[PDB]
Design a protein around this nucleic acid. Sequence first.
RNA 1: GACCUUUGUACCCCAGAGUGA
Lengths: 51, 122, 239, 370
Amino acid sequence: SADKVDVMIIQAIALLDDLDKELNTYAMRCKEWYGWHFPELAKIVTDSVAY
Amino acid sequence: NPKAFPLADAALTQQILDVVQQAANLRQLKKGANEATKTLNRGISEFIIMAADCEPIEILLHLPLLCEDKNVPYVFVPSRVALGRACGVSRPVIAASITTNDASAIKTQIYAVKDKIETLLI
Amino acid sequence: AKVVIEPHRHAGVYIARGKEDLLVTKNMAPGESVYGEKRISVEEPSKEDGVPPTKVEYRVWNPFRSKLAAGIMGGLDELFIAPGKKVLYLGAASGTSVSHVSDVVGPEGVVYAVEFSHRPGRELISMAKKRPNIIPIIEDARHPQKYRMLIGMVDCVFADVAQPDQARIIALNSHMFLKDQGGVVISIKANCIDSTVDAETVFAREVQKLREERIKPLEQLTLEPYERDHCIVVGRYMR
Amino acid sequence: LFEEPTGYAVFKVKLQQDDIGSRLKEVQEQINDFGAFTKLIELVSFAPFKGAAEALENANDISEGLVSESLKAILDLNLPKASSKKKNITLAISDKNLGPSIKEEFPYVDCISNELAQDLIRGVRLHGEKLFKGLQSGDLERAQLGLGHAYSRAKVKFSVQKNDNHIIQAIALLDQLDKDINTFAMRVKEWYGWHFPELAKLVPDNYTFAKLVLFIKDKASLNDDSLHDLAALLNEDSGIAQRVIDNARISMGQDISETDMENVCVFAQRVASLADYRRQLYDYLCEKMHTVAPNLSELIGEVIGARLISHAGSLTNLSKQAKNKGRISRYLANKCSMASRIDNYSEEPSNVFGSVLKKQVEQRLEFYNT
RNA sequence: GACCUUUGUACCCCAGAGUGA
C-alpha cells in the first residue's frame, strides 16, 4: 500500500481501554440506579455482564 | 394533615407580640425566613416565630426541620400582619428569629416565652 | 490534602495529624456527603497485577454537631461501642451522628434508630437505602413494648433523647432489650429537665434515680469547650 | 402458677409450657442463673407467618393491641387436657393492652401481664437461636432487617415524589453519554477522513456523518442518485447534495477494502446506539422533570433545574438552603428558593403557584427596564 | 547478574453562602 498500514493497531489499542472504561462506568451507573429496587444483588453477583 | 401545629392561644400570642416589640426595640430580632435560616446556621437563634396566614404555607416548612435538627423551639402565630406590627414595622413579616444575648435587658421575658413554647412542644 | 492518619486508642476511631487535631472515621459509602463535611482521600493502593488500586476516603467528624466526638475530644476513658457489637441508638434529630456510629460499628454491626417525629424519618429511610447497616424503627419511644417483635437483643444502649422524664424511658428499654453486663450511655441537656434550679442537683438526682434502676455510673463529665451546660454519663447494667 | 406463656417475634408465633418460675425473690443468685441457662421451659407449639405482606399487617395489629385470627387458631390448643376453663390458665405476655383483648375473646382464659418485664421473656430472646426447632436462620435476621424497613418505610412513606436522585443520575449519565458521543465521532471522522478526505470537511454533524459512512462504504457510489442516500435523510435539492456530486468526482483518497470498513460499520452503529439512548433519556428527563418539580420547570425549565438539584443532591437539601443583572439573578434565587420549598411538600405543587410566581418574574422583568 | 510541566486555539468574562430604609 501507499502508507504501509500499521497505524490502525496503534489506533485500536488506544480505543480498547477507553471502551472498557465506558463499560465499567455504565455498569456501575446501572448498579447505582437499580440498587433502589433490589440492593441485595451486587454482593452476590459482581460481574458487569451477568448483572 | 394539620400543618398548623402548634398554634398559640390568645394571651400567649399577645405576650409574644409584646416580647417581639421590646426585641425590635433592642435590635435583637431577625426579619425574614432567609435571615432566620442564616441564624439557624450560625447557632445564634433562640427560637423562631412563623405565621399561619402566609400564602402559600409550604415556603415556611423548612424551619421546623432545621430547628429540630438544631433542637430549637418554634410556635406558629395566626397573623402575619400583627407579626409585622410587633416588629415596629408597617408591612408584614412572615417569620422572625430571636438572637442570642446573655447581656440582654429582656432576657427573663425570653426565658418565660421559651418556657411556654417548650411546654407546648411536648 | 497533605495530612497523615493513625489508629487511635479506641478501636474504630481514627486520628488525623497534624496542623489541626482532627477526628475521622472510615466511610463505607464512597463519596457521599451528609452535611457538607470534607473528606480526606488516602490510599494504600497497588500497581501490581491481580490487585487493583484501592480508593479510600475518610470523613471528619464535627464535635460541634455531634455529642460523641465532643465526648472523645474532651477525654473519656472507654467507649462501649466497638467493632462487633450491637447498638441501640435513641434520638434521630438529623441522622448526622448515625452515619459515624454506622461507621464505627462496622459492617458486622447493626445500628438501630428510633424516632416518632415522622417528617425527619424519611431522611433516615433514604440513608437506610444508602448505608446497609442503619435500620430505622419509627415509633414513640415511650412504648417499646409495642415493637417487641421488631428488634433483637443488644449489647449497648445509647440515649440522646431530651425529655423531662427520660429516666423511665431508659428504664423500659434497659429492662427489656439489653443484654447482661452491657453498656448504658445517657446524654443530658441541662435545661430540658429543669431550669428553676442548679444543673448540679439535677445531676445528683439524675445519677441517683439512674442508680435506682440497677445501673452503676463510672464517671460523668462537663463539656465546657464545646457544648455549654451539657453532660454525658457512662454506666453499667447490673454490675 | 398455672402458666403457659407465648413467645412473640418476627420468628414464628411460639407457645411454650413452663415448669415453674422462681417465686423466690430478686437476689444475685436467681437472676444471674436465669440470665444464661434457661431450661425449665420447653417449646410446645409454633406457627410461621411466611407472608411478607402478612407479617407486617400482623405487626400493626400486635403493635396496636389487636389480635389476629391465626393467633386464635394457635390458641386453639388445649384439647388433650380434656377441657378449657377447668384450667383457669394464666397467660403472661409483653403487652398490657393485649390482655383485655384476649380476655374479651376468651372468657375461658385468665390473662395477666405481671410481670411486664418478666425475665423469663428475656430468657426466650437471649437463647432464641437454639430453639429454632426446624426453623431456618439465614435470611431470618435478613427478614428482621427488611421487615424493619417494611414497618418504618410503611408508616410514613408511600413513594411520594421519589425522584430525588433519579434526575441526578439522568443528567450525569446523559452528560457522560455526550462525552462518549464525541469520542467515537472523532474516530469515525478520522477514519473516513482517510478514505475520503472531503466529506469530513463537509458535514459538521456526527450522527449524519455516521449514517453516511455506514450505508455507503464506497467513494464512487455516494450520490443523491445511483444510489439514493440523500433522498432519505436529507433532500437532494439541498446545498449539500450538489457538493456531494462535486466531491464524488474529484476525490484522490486511499481506496480501502471491505474488512477495514466493517469495523467502521460497528463504530457507526455505536454512534446510533448513543444517539438513541440520549434522545430517549432526554425525553424521560423531560417527563420526570415535569413530575417531581413542576414549578421549577415552570420557572427555569428542565436543564438548570436538574443541574441545581444535581448540585444539592435532593429537593430537601435544596429546600433547607437559602452590573444590573444580579438583581434579576438574586430575585430568581429567592423565588426559586420559594418554589423549591413548594415542590418539596406534597402535591399542592401540582397547582399554579409557580405560574403566578413566573408572573411575578414577568413583573420584575417589567421593573428593571423603567 | 539485576503518567508531569510549557506554547497556541474556543468558551467564560467571574454577588454565593455579602449588607440589611
